[PDB]
Structure 1
Amino acid sequence: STGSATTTPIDSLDDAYITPVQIGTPAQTLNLDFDTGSSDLWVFSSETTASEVDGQTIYTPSKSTTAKLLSGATWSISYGDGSSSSGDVYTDTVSVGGLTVTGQAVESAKKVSSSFTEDSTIDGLLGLAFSTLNTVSPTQQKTFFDNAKASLDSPVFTADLGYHAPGTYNFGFIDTTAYTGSITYTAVSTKQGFWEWTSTGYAVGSGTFKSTSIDGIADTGTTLLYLPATVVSAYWAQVSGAKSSSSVGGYVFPCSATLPSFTFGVGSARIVIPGDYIDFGPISTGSSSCFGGIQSSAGIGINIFGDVALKAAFVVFNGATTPTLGFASK
């Protein structure tokens, strides 16, 4: 089997991407944030505290003839941005782009933190990291991809995120028309539960490539590119007037600037992030200070190849017995 679904930016800055997902019988369609940095499929629901729901579409398990309470199971997750959610668990039928999994754990939110409530466009998350990170207790549950894998034509999914435009998540096949050149594959460590890999270096603009190992994760659920402070300083030093602002919380730059590209290495191959992809717009409405799309990972503990990086590439998440990642230009 295969599946193919369009993913759409939630706003004009590509702050996140939403993909429609069918849950239950009859189908209830919710727009979920596909997140290769976590491993829980959770939704706003009829059980979510009413004051914490503000415009999201909810899953109502009582209206699904295939929903079953997973008795005793609870979940609770906290994300790298400080947001969180928790609740109980149902199993139900879940379909993405024509690919159907029966018996998928659908984690129903009883509580969500303020940033989830405030984002009316995201109805939940669909985790695509390794199932060892799934938070369900006392019986850990499998991700949608893990449940689907055996049925897929090939044990892979691909992320093709757009810049200021829709893109595609495919399951079970590699669309050879969706990229240019060849796909360069690189090793993955699953020891922390992430799609963790090692970039071979970077360049800023037309500058010479610096060969240096940068361990990090491919995370579709993180907006920006988080890299070591040395690398980030070298980038922003090329932008007149750019500075790290403790009050804003990262590097800012004059909105009048034209930004240089940033290149990252995948083995001997190179992925070029155009400068425009690094512009996240005014820090507050009407400001002439703009927020940078490349930020320091120093306070995280891990480098994160988020959407800024991934949207410049066609990315293969290869879930073969030994997982690997593939990157192609597009």
Structure 2
Amino acid sequence: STGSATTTPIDSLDDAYITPVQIGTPAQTLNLDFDTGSSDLWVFSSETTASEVDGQTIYTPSKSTTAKLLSGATWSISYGDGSSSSGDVYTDTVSVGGLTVTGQAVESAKKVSSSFTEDSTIDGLLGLAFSTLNTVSPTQQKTFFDNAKASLDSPVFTADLGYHAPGTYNFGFIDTTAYTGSITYTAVSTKQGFWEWTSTGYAVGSGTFKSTSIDGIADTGTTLLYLPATVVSAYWAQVSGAKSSSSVGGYVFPCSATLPSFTFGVGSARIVIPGDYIDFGPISTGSSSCFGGIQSSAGIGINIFGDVALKAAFVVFNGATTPTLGFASK
């Protein structure tokens, strides 16, 4: 089997992407944030504290003939941005782009933090990291991908995120029309539960390539590109007037600037992030100070190849016995 679903930016900045997901019988379609940096499929629901729902579409298990309470199971998760959610668990039928999993753990939110409430366009998350990170207790549950894997034509999914435009998540096949050149595959460590890999280096604009190992995670659930402070400093030094602002919480730059591209290495291959991808606009409405899309990972504890990086590529998440990551230009 295979699946193929369109993923759409939630706003004009590509802050995140939502993908429609069918849950239950009859189908209830929710727009979820596919997140290769976590491993819980959780949704706004009929159980979510009413004051914490503001425009989201909710899952109502009582209206699904295939929903079953997973008795005793609870979940609780906190993300790198400080947001969180928690609740109980149902199993139900879940379909993504024509691909169907029966008995999928659907984690029903009783509580969500303000960040989730304030984002009316995101009805929940669908985790695509390794199942070892799943927070369901006392019985850890599998991701949608893990559950689907054996049924897939090939044990892979691919992320093809658009710049200011829709893109695609495919499951079970590699669309050879969706990228240019060849796919370069690179080793993955699952030791922390992430799609963790080592970039071979970087370049700033038309500058010379610096060979240096950068350990990081491929994370579709993170907006920006977070890299070591040395790297990020070298990038923003090429932008006149750019500076790190503790009051804003990162590098800002004059909105009148032209941003240089940023290149990262995948083995001997190179992925180029156009400068426009690194522009996240005025820090506040009407400001002439603009927020940068490349930020320091210092104090995160890990480097994150988030959407800014990943949307410049066609990315293969290979869940074979020995997982790997593939990157192609597009």
Q: What CA distance in whole angstroms lies between the structure 1 residues aligned with 2:57 and 2:22?
A: 12
Deviation per CA, 1:252-291, whole angstroms, max 9, x where unpaired?
0000001000000000000000000000000000000000
Give the secondary-structure state (helix, strand or coil) at the position aligned to 2:222.
coil
SS at match of 2:230: helix
2:23 matched residue in structure 1: 23
CA distance in 2, matches of 1:119, 1:172: 31
Q: How far is 1:22 from its partner?
A: 0.1
Query: Structure 2 CA distance, aligned partners of 1:163 and 1:4?
Result: 19
Distance across 1 between alignment mates of 2:61 and 2:188 = 37
Distance (whole Å) between structure 1 residues aligned to residue 313 and residue 5 of structure 2: 17
> 1 CA distance for matches of 2:10 and 2:256?
25
Secondary structure of residue in 1 paired with 2:263: strand
Matched residue, 2:66: 66
> Structure 2 CA distance, aligned partners of 1:171 and 1:233?
37
**Which runs of 5 or more structure 1 residues have no equivalent in the other structure?**
none
Aligned residue number for residue 282 of structure 1 = 282
| Residues 200-248 of structure 1: per-residue CA shift (max 9 Å, x gap) | 0000000000000000000000000000000000000000000000000
State the 1:173 CA deviation: 0.1
Q: Give the C-alpha shift of residue 90 in structure 1.
A: 0.1
Q: Distance in 1 between matches of 2:230 and 2:162?
A: 28
Distance 1:126 1:119 in 2: 16
What is the deviation of 1:299? Answer: 1.1
Q: Deviations over 1:94-126 (max 9, x none)?
A: 000000000000000000000000000000000
In 2, Cα distance between the equivalents of 1:58 and 1:309?
Answer: 31
State the percentage of identical aligned residues: 100
Q: Which residue number corresponds to residue 152 of structure 2? A: 152
Secondary structure at the aligned position of 2:235 is classed as: helix
Q: TM-score with structure 1 length normalisation? A: 1.00
Q: How many residues align?
A: 330
Aligned-pair CA distance for 1:171: 0.1
CA distance in 2, matches of 1:249, 1:134: 30
**Residue aligned with 2:252, SS:** strand
Q: Is the partner of 1:137 in helix, strand or coil?
A: coil
1:153-232, aligned counterparts within 5 Å?
A: 153-232=153-232
CA distance in 2, matches of 1:268, 1:187: 13
Q: Deviations for 1:180-207, whole angstroms, at most 9, x for unmatched residues?
A: 0000000000000000000000000000
User: Aligned partners of 1:284 and 1:119: how far apart in 2?
Assistant: 17
**Cα separation, 2, equivalents of 1:54 and 1:287:** 28
CA RMSD of aligned residues (A): 0.1
Aligned partner of 1:265 in structure 2 is 265
Partners of 2:216 and 2:292 lie apart in 1 by: 19
Shift of 1:60: 0.1
2:4 aligned counterpart, secondary structure? strand
Q: Does 1:48 align with 2:48?
A: yes
CA distance in 1, matches of 2:32, 2:47: 17
How big is each residue's C-alpha offset from its partner over 1:32-57, in whole Å with a ceiling of 9 and x where there is no partner? 00000000000000000000000000
Provide the rounded CA distance (Å) in 2 between the counterparts of 1:167 and 1:258.
Answer: 26
The CA distance in 1 between the partners of 2:115 and 2:259, in whole Å, is 29
Q: How much has 1:318 moved relative to structure 2?
A: 0.1
- Is 1:9 matched with 2:41? no
How far apart are 1:322 and its partner, in Å?
0.1
Distance apart, 1:26 and its partner CA: 0.1
Q: Secondary structure at the match of 1:260?
A: coil
What does 1:291-302 align with in structure 2 at a 5 Å threshold? 291-302=291-302
Aligned-partner Cα distance in 1 for 2:255–2:193: 38
Deviation at 1:16, TM superposition (A): 0.1
Aligned to 1:143: 143
Q: Distance in 1 between matches of 2:83 and 2:220?
A: 16
How far has the Cα of 1:316 moved from its partner? 0.0
**Residues 144-169 of structure 1: CA deviation (Å, up to 9, x unaligned):** 00000000000000000000000000
Question: What SS does the corresponding residue of 2:276 show, helix, strand or coil?
Answer: helix
Distance 2:37 2:43 in 1: 17
The C-alpha deviation readout for 1:282-317, integer Å capped at 9, x for no partner, is: 000000000000000001000000000000000000
- SS of the residue aligned with 1:162? coil
d(CA) in 2 for partners of 1:186 and 1:241? Answer: 36
